[PDB]
Design a protein around this nucleic acid. Structure first.
Length: 187
RNA sequence: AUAUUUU
């Protein structure tokens, strides 16, 4: 049972580390604004408004507990424990031609998921194919899931491996997997 | 409707 508490805390850490991570932060208008207010610090009162974290827990003490154990050590907790921020010692990487070129080469296109599949279904299916840093579910202008996604792996090596494996299926349904740039070339 | 939500 104590195991479940560890699991919840590992998920809380992962979710918050995603919001403040290299992939999401540079594209997060709302969050980039909060960060400019009090030297990076964002009150837990605000953090609780984040749906995904909300679903995990809205309790400040749990969140702080979870973060204080994080292995990533990306986040910093204030003394009064009412706010958190990305460590000033882990600044965002400079987005150079090279950085972007590397990102594109680590991005994959996958088609074949059912329209009702959720980010959680997809995340679970992916925890066995390499370290994923971002999952983008492709939706219509009105937010309807198209069944296709873009995935960004931790490195071009893990992405290459994944794209190389031919017999992949989701809940025993065939899947079309290509490198993201290759997908655009065809389309 | 910045009432932005993997905010």
């Amino acid at each position: 049972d104590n195991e479940k508490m560890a699991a919840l805390e590992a998920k809380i850490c992962h979710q918050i580390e995603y919001y403040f991570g290299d992939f999401n932060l540079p594209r997060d208008k709302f969050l980039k604004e909060q960060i400019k207010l009090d030297e990076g610090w964002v009150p837990l009162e605000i953090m609780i408004k984040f749906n995904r974290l909300n679903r995990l827990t809205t309790d400040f003490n749990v969140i702080v507990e979870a973060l204080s154990k994080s292995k990533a050590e990306l986040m910093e907790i204030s003394e009064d424990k009412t706010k958190i921020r990305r460590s000033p010692s882990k600044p965002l990487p400079e987005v150079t031609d090279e950085y972007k070129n590397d990102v594109k080469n680590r991005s994959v296109y996958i088609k074949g998921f059912p329209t009702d599949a959720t980010l959680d279904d997809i995340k679970e299916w992916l925890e066995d194919k390499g370290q994923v840093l971002n999952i983008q579910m492709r939706r219509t202008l009105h937010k309807a899931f198209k069944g296709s996604i873009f995935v960004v792996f931790d490195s071009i090596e893990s992405a290459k491996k994944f794209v190389e494996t031919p017999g992949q299926k989701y809940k025993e349904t065939d899947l079309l997997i290509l490198f993201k740039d290759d997908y655009f070339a065809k389309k």
